[PDB]
Amino acid sequence: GPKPPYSYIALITMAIQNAPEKKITLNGIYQFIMDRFPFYRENKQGWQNSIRHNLSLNECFVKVPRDDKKPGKGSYWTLDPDSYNMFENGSFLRRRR
DNA sequence: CAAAATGTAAACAAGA
DNA sequence: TCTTGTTTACATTTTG
Ligand SMILES: [Mg+2]
Secondary structure (H helix, E strand, C coil): CCCCCCCHHHHHHHHHHHCCCCCECHHHHHHHHHHHCHHHHCCHHHHHHHHHHHHHHCCCEEEECCCCCCCCCCCEEEECHHHCCCECCCCCCCECC
16 A cells, blocks of 8 residues: 555654653564554565664654563663654644644 | 754665 | 664755
8 A cells, every 4th residue: 555644753652652661672563563464564675774764863762771671572662752743633643843 | 154953875884 | 684873965846
């Protein structure tokens, strides 16, 4: 199908906010996106590289260490408290300020 | 308009 | 070899 209107910053924010403890692994972001929007089930090589790119580049996505090496691999990704509500509505179509 | 934000691709590295 | 994470580069879009 066609690509949804949501940006990569918006997609990552959805996954973090959806997590019960508001922290999510990189693979959990993949599964959240693909489960929510079937378009990203195809051609995983491209948009996942963009996902990683946005996690490191943007200050809003801060990586924090993990408890033990049991749940998956890598570290948890969380939202910088300043940019938690960086989107206006909760429809995630554009940022505020 | 200029600058910032964003999308996309890719070189690169540490580690299991 | 694969996964994760960082970084530079460039074109297009959005914002101020
Ligand atoms: Mg970051």
